[PDB]
């Protein structure tokens, strides 16, 4: 009997004031939340943000919407949401969000007989995440989502995770190219501004960066160029054009590798781990070129000392480069 | 009782003309402003602007909204803001702005018994900022936000910072990788257009640019290439191919550094500090190449003079480069 359902729903919205919260003037209304993370699309060091798509569900009780005589959950057309009170929830650290609207607004309203309202949205949000790049690309980040009431203080509204630590689902299915999600955490607290105290829910993820792209992209080219620079020690010292060509080529390749590295990051003012490695490699290739300069300078009058310097450089440069690699990879792992 | 408050608000909005300002036809209405800065997302030299996110709070008194019998402040659902008069505040130097709208429009309305309205918005605005880059990257910028009334002249409306020097908070939340905030300033004045005189608030920040990134990525490569160009002085003058290769490589690499760096900025006509540094380094490397050219020209008939020239260049070039660096870094710091 749909006519009775229609009359009941018309009756529920008779004299209903959407300007007033449930239990207005009384104890705070409790809103429970849960989130299904559909995806985490892109994490950007350049923009210091990440994108996230989720099903966001809010739960509360409104006794003006209690009904009797219908033993069913009432799923209503989502436009009824424009005729009801809903919480004024927002994300503090977001930069641009939207509700999906194809084919219609991705919104859900479900009433229960006791007056309980389930309100669901599908949201894509870009959120700020300040990143510490001092150990990049061997770094680990902590990106959060902050959920707050905008207008209502803790005297009017309270937040809580519905189900405790089970309130956020779908994190374990997320696959990221550059990162892996070590852990996620749920926090509830209060935050005080000049206009009062507000409830706050926090959802945090810890992301660990994968190293393989950087092994293939920056570390191995640097190692190979540094090794290439050592071929000079095995060419006779009187071949000036050849050894100068080797030194120049290695220095140019070091600069090229560094520029391709820096073209993908924000302009932070401190030194990163990859920067440290690249300038170690640059010091090595520059020292090899200087070694040839010394040998070429002194070999006219002291051929034996020049031969000894070349012979010892055959051994010393690999040994010191191996030591530098050992120290670097032990200090950062 | 929710119905009593419901009828109180219904009485407040009964007979309310939204087309008229408070005290229309009488003394001007005073609007107090507060700004709580959440972040400055980015500062762009290419687009000559910056993006700011903030809580913008306006305070005024509308006697038509006074109510009695409820010793409480009514926090209303923000949709009621569509039924009230609000000031026509705009930002003169803004280029694109939006109010955040997830999950609802980030808007707040709070009424007080005597008729005071508190009206809050969460706004992200991209505001224009003309930058003088003559001292770049050692430059200091001043970026402002201009708050004005569009339609109402000073006879209708007045603006003031509510709280004086404490009207803007959250300046310590500004985390820019390439800048640091040195100072912020609040200004109140009037601006005369052909349609009358209008109140104007002004909020300005002084940005100091951090030099670390440019030291790491621009100055050091140039210094290292200039030093590499001096290795030619220590190589015997019979190695024409080796020394010519050294000089040519240094010259072309300096030109490449300058072009690549300048391509990433707006096409301003004047010379920046970094440009003057790069041009000095270019002069040094070009002079080293010219020195070898002269030595190669004269050494088959005057070998002693050529040897003396190389011997003196070894000492002279580092000394003059050190003097150039001392003068440059004293003038610009």
């Amino acid at each position, epitope marked *: 009997n749909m006519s009775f359902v229609k009359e009941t729903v018309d009756k529920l919205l008779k004299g209903y004031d959407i300007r007033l919260r449930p239990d207005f003037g009384g104890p705070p209304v409790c809103v429970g939340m849960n989130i299904d993370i559909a995806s985490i699309d892109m994490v950007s060091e350049v923009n210091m943000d990440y994108t996230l798509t989720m099903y966001f569900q809010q739960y509360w009780r409104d006794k003006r919407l209690a009904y009797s005589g219908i033993p069913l959950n009432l799923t209503l057309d989502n436009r009824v949401a424009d005729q009801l009170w809903v919480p004024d929830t927002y994300f503090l650290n977001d930069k641009k969000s939207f509700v999906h609207g194809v084919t219609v607004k991705n919104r859900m309203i479900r009433l229960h007989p006791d007056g309980t309202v389930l309100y669901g949205l599908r949201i894509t949000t870009t959120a700020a995440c*300040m990143m510490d790049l001092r150990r990049y690309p061997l770094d680990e980040q902590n990106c959060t989502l902050e959920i707050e009431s905008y207008g209502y203080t803790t005297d009017d509204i309270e937040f809580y995770w519905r189900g405790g630590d089970k309130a956020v689902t779908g994190v374990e299915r997320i696959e990221l190219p550059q990162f892996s999600i070590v852990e996620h955490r749920l926090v509830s607290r209060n*935050v*005080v*501004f000049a206009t009062g105290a507000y409830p706050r829910l926090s959802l945090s993820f810890r992301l660990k960066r994968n190293i393989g792209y950087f092994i293939l992209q920056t570390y191995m080219p640097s190692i190979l160029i540094t090794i290439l620079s050592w071929v000079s020690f095995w060419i006779n010292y009187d071949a000036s054009a050849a050894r100068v060509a080797l030194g120049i080529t290695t220095v140019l390749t070091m600069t090229t590798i560094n520029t391709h590295l820096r073209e993908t990051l924000p302009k932070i003012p401190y030194v990163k781990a990859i920067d440290m490695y690249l300038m170690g490699c640059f010091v090595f290739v520059f020292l090899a070129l200087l070694e040839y300069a010394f040998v070429n300078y002194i070999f006219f009058s002291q051929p034996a000392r020049a031969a000894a310097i070349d012979r010892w450089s055959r051994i010393v440069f690999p040994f010191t480069f191996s030591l530098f690699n050992l120290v670097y990879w032990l200090y950062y792992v | 009782n929710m119905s009593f408050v419901k009828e109180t608000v219904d009485k407040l909005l009964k007979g309310y003309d939204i087309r008229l300002r408070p005290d229309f036809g009488g003394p001007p209405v005073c609007v107090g402003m507060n700004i709580d800065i959440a972040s400055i997302d980015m500062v762009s030299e290419v687009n000559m602007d910056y993006t700011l996110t903030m809580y913008f709070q306006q305070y005024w008194r509308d006697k038509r909204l006074a109510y009695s019998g409820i010793p409480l402040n009514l926090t209303l659902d923000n949709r009621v803001a569509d039924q009230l008069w609000v000031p026509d505040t705009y930002f003169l130097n803004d280029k694109k702005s939006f109010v955040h709208g997830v999950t609802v429009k980030n808007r707040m309305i709070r009424l007080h018994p005597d008729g005071t309205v508190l009206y809050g918005l969460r706004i992200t605005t991209t505001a224009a900022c003309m930058m003088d880059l003559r001292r770049y990257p050692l430059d200091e910028q001043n970026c402002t936000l201009e708050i004005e009334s569009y339609g109402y002249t000073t006879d209708d409306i007045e603006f003031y910072w509510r709280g004086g020097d404490k009207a803007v908070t959250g300046v*310590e939340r500004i985390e820019l990788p390439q800048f640091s*905030i040195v100072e912020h300033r609040l200004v109140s004045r009037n601006v005369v257009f052909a349609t009358g005189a209008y109140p104007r608030l002004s909020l300005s920040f002084r940005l100091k640019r951090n030099i670390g990134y440019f030291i790491l990525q621009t100055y050091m490569p140039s210094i290292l290439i200039t030093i590499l160009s001096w290795v030619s002085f220590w190589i015997n003058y019979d190695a024409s191919a080796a020394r010519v290769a050294l000089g040519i490589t240094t010259v072309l690499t300096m030109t490449t550094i300058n072009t690549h760096l300048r391509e990433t900025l707006p096409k301003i006509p004047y010379v920046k500090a970094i440009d003057m540094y790069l041009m000095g380094c270019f002069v040094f490397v070009f002079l080293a190449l010219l020195e070898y050219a002269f030595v190669n020209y004269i050494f088959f008939s005057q070998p002693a003079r050529a040897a003396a020239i190389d011997r003196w260049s070894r000492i002279v070039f580092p000394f003059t480069f050190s003097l150039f660096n001392l003068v440059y870094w004293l003038y610009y710091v």
Partner: nanobody
Amino acid sequence: LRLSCAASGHTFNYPIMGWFRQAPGKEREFVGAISWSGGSTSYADSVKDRFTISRDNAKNTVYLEMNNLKPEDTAVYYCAAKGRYSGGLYYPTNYDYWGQGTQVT
């Protein structure tokens, strides 16, 4: 007199250090706050031009120098860390990690 607050661990997640003092009969009172990186200080009215706050990231320290004392400056002093999205700068509730109390007469 000079109070030093040396912080270790995750100072990146808590980029702001603040100073508070508790009187025997009054609640905790905000004194000043310092940003670890930006070095942008903020002060309460009662200690403007008198107390100074400095930061050094070499060993992760923040210094409160107290000068021109008064008998109304006899309170147990605390240092605290504030999260990135923790709210207002003047409210003790928003600070998570609190240091040990220090007495001044």
